[PDB]
Amino acid sequence: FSAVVSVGDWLQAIKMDRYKDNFTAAGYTTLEAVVHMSQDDLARIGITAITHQNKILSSVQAMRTQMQQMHG
Amino acid sequence: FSAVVSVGDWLQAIKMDRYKDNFTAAGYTTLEAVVHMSQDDLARIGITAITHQNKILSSVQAMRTQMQQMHG
């Protein structure tokens, strides 16, 4: 059991679900793996649009900060 | 948007879903709130069976450790 939601749910929530297959094909099936991605990882995955890279990276930053609060 | 699942999902996963209403009635609607509970909070909520208190507390401990790994 995992306390975190699916990558698919996260992508739809940030309107980047057009990239669902991009994450899956590269083995990024859990948010734990996604949260440790870099800009280069996103480019390698097929997300070359800098705007989309930033939306995803900003979201990752917010999810990490949210997870820090999951254990004060 | 929250990256964590519902209290209901967590309770069913640890077979403590008989207590769904106990959490809700006391305002524990998010896992963020649940993760900061103490034994006394569980008793006050109606979970008096020590075995059930421990199953829940042990789960909380595991979810917290899992969330630490959500930002290495």
CSV table of C-alpha atoms in Angstrom, one decimal:
chain,number,residue,atom,x,y,z
A,1,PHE,CA,0.0,0.0,0.0
A,2,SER,CA,1.2,3.5,-1.0
A,3,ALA,CA,-0.2,6.7,0.6
A,4,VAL,CA,0.5,8.7,-2.6
A,5,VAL,CA,-1.7,8.9,-5.7
A,6,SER,CA,-1.0,7.8,-9.2
A,7,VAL,CA,1.2,9.6,-11.7
A,8,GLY,CA,-1.9,9.7,-14.0
A,9,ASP,CA,-4.0,11.5,-11.4
A,10,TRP,CA,-1.2,14.0,-10.8
A,11,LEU,CA,-0.8,14.7,-14.5
A,12,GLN,CA,-4.5,15.3,-15.1
A,13,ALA,CA,-4.6,17.6,-12.1
A,14,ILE,CA,-1.8,19.8,-13.6
A,15,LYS,CA,-3.2,19.4,-17.1
A,16,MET,CA,-0.1,17.6,-18.4
A,17,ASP,CA,-1.9,14.3,-19.0
A,18,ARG,CA,-0.9,14.5,-22.7
A,19,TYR,CA,2.4,13.1,-21.3
A,20,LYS,CA,1.0,10.1,-19.5
A,21,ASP,CA,2.6,7.6,-21.9
A,22,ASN,CA,5.9,9.6,-21.7
A,23,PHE,CA,6.3,8.8,-18.0
A,24,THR,CA,5.1,5.2,-18.3
A,25,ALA,CA,7.4,4.3,-21.2
A,26,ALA,CA,10.4,5.4,-19.3
A,27,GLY,CA,9.5,3.5,-16.1
A,28,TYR,CA,8.1,6.5,-14.2
A,29,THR,CA,5.1,4.7,-12.8
A,30,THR,CA,5.1,6.1,-9.3
A,31,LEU,CA,5.2,9.6,-7.9
A,32,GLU,CA,8.2,8.6,-5.8
A,33,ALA,CA,10.2,8.3,-9.0
A,34,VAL,CA,8.7,11.4,-10.6
A,35,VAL,CA,9.6,13.5,-7.6
A,36,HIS,CA,13.3,12.8,-8.2
A,37,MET,CA,13.4,13.9,-11.8
A,38,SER,CA,15.5,16.7,-13.2
A,39,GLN,CA,15.0,18.9,-16.3
A,40,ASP,CA,17.2,16.5,-18.3
A,41,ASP,CA,15.0,13.6,-17.3
A,42,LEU,CA,11.9,15.4,-18.6
A,43,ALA,CA,13.7,16.2,-21.9
A,44,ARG,CA,14.9,12.6,-22.3
A,45,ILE,CA,11.2,11.5,-21.7
A,46,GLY,CA,9.9,13.7,-24.6
A,47,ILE,CA,8.9,16.8,-22.7
A,48,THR,CA,10.9,19.3,-24.7
A,49,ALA,CA,8.6,22.3,-24.3
A,50,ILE,CA,10.3,24.4,-21.6
A,51,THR,CA,6.9,25.7,-20.4
A,52,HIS,CA,5.7,22.2,-19.8
A,53,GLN,CA,9.0,21.3,-18.1
A,54,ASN,CA,8.5,24.2,-15.7
A,55,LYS,CA,4.9,23.4,-14.9
A,56,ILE,CA,6.0,19.8,-14.0
A,57,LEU,CA,9.1,20.9,-12.1
A,58,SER,CA,7.1,23.5,-10.2
A,59,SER,CA,4.5,20.9,-9.3
A,60,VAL,CA,7.3,18.5,-8.1
A,61,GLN,CA,8.6,21.3,-5.9
A,62,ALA,CA,5.1,21.8,-4.3
A,63,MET,CA,4.5,18.1,-3.8
A,64,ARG,CA,7.9,17.7,-2.1
A,65,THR,CA,7.1,20.6,0.3
A,66,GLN,CA,3.7,19.0,0.9
A,67,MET,CA,5.3,15.7,1.8
A,68,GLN,CA,7.7,17.4,4.3
A,69,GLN,CA,4.5,18.5,6.2
A,70,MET,CA,3.4,14.8,6.2
A,71,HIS,CA,5.8,14.3,9.1
A,72,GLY,CA,6.4,17.2,11.4
B,1,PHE,CA,-4.6,19.2,-5.5
B,2,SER,CA,-3.2,16.8,-2.9
B,3,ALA,CA,-0.6,14.1,-3.7
B,4,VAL,CA,-1.9,11.9,-0.9
B,5,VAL,CA,-4.8,9.5,-1.0
B,6,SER,CA,-8.0,9.6,1.1
B,7,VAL,CA,-8.4,8.5,4.7
B,8,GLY,CA,-11.0,6.1,3.4
B,9,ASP,CA,-8.6,4.4,1.0
B,10,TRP,CA,-6.0,4.1,3.8
B,11,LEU,CA,-8.4,2.6,6.3
B,12,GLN,CA,-9.7,0.0,3.8
B,13,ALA,CA,-6.1,-0.9,2.9
B,14,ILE,CA,-5.3,-1.6,6.6
B,15,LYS,CA,-8.7,-3.2,7.2
B,16,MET,CA,-9.7,-0.6,9.7
B,17,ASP,CA,-12.5,0.8,7.6
B,18,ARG,CA,-15.0,0.0,10.3
B,19,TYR,CA,-13.7,3.3,11.8
B,20,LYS,CA,-14.3,5.5,8.7
B,21,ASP,CA,-17.0,7.5,10.4
B,22,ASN,CA,-14.9,7.8,13.6
B,23,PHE,CA,-12.3,9.9,11.7
B,24,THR,CA,-14.8,11.9,9.7
B,25,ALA,CA,-17.0,12.9,12.7
B,26,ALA,CA,-13.9,14.3,14.5
B,27,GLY,CA,-12.7,16.3,11.5
B,28,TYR,CA,-10.0,13.9,10.4
B,29,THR,CA,-10.7,14.1,6.7
B,30,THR,CA,-7.2,14.2,5.3
B,31,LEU,CA,-4.2,11.9,5.9
B,32,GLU,CA,-2.2,15.0,6.8
B,33,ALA,CA,-4.3,15.3,10.0
B,34,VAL,CA,-4.3,11.6,10.6
B,35,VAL,CA,-0.5,11.4,10.5
B,36,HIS,CA,-0.3,13.7,13.5
B,37,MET,CA,-2.6,11.7,15.8
B,38,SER,CA,-1.5,10.2,19.1
B,39,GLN,CA,-2.9,7.2,21.0
B,40,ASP,CA,-5.1,9.6,23.0
B,41,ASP,CA,-6.6,11.0,19.8
B,42,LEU,CA,-7.6,7.5,18.6
B,43,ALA,CA,-9.2,6.8,22.0
B,44,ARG,CA,-11.1,10.1,21.9
B,45,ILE,CA,-12.3,9.2,18.4
B,46,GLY,CA,-13.8,5.9,19.6
B,47,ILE,CA,-11.0,3.5,18.8
B,48,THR,CA,-10.5,1.9,22.2
B,49,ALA,CA,-9.3,-1.5,21.2
B,50,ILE,CA,-5.6,-1.3,21.8
B,51,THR,CA,-4.9,-3.8,19.0
B,52,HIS,CA,-6.7,-1.5,16.5
B,53,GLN,CA,-4.9,1.6,18.0
B,54,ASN,CA,-1.6,-0.2,17.3
B,55,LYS,CA,-2.4,-1.2,13.8
B,56,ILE,CA,-3.3,2.4,13.0
B,57,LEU,CA,-0.3,3.9,14.8
B,58,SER,CA,2.1,1.4,13.1
B,59,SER,CA,0.6,2.4,9.8
B,60,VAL,CA,1.0,6.1,10.5
B,61,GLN,CA,4.7,5.4,11.3
B,62,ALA,CA,5.2,3.6,8.0
B,63,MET,CA,3.4,6.4,6.0
B,64,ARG,CA,5.6,9.0,7.6
B,65,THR,CA,8.8,7.1,6.8
B,66,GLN,CA,7.4,6.7,3.2
B,67,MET,CA,6.8,10.4,3.0
B,68,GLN,CA,10.4,11.2,4.1
B,69,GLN,CA,11.5,9.3,1.0
B,70,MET,CA,9.3,11.6,-1.1
B,71,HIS,CA,12.0,14.2,-0.9
B,72,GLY,CA,15.6,13.0,-0.7
